[PDB]
Design a protein around this ligand. Sequence first.
Ligand SMILES: Cn1ccnc1-c1noc(C2CCC2)n1
Ligand SMILES: [Zn+2]
Ligand SMILES: [Zn+2]
Ligand SMILES: [Zn+2]
Ligand SMILES: [Zn+2]
Lengths: 69, 69
Amino acid sequence: SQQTRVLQEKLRKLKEAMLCMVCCEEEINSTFCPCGHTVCCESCAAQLQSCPVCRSRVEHVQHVYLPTH
Amino acid sequence: SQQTRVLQEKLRKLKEAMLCMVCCEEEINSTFCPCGHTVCCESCAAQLQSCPVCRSRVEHVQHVYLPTH
Ligand SMILES: Cn1ccnc1-c1noc(C2CCC2)n1
Ligand SMILES: [Zn+2]
Ligand SMILES: [Zn+2]
Ligand SMILES: [Zn+2]
Ligand SMILES: [Zn+2]
């Protein structure tokens, strides 16, 4: 039905929101510290000096294990 | 159709995976450091001296800004 199509759309959008903002291909699993933006995979996060969202300096990257992984 | 029911179940399971494993009521937004388990809301994470997933000592809690929030 049309309702099946609407639910398919919500699932797709939620899954897309879990992908790296830089490469769009790998799941987010890294946090820029201390700001806390968790928007990248480990490969894309490794080389950024400043947060791509808020421009704060990245002191380090913390790996995160999310239940959605 | 039955497919609408199946998609409703996938969306429910994905949304449940975003809720605190301790209180089951608030969104996950906190990471236990240094282990990296990100399974609690800020209120439950502030009360645990040990990680509920791996039992490593919590040195500190890092707030995470996720795109799914
Ligand atoms: C593979 N590994 C090693 C240590 N921890 C993990 C792990 N994987 O997924 C998870 C999530 C946290 C809630 C379940 N943890
Ligand atoms: Zn990436
Ligand atoms: Zn930031
Ligand atoms: Zn909680
Ligand atoms: Zn842990």
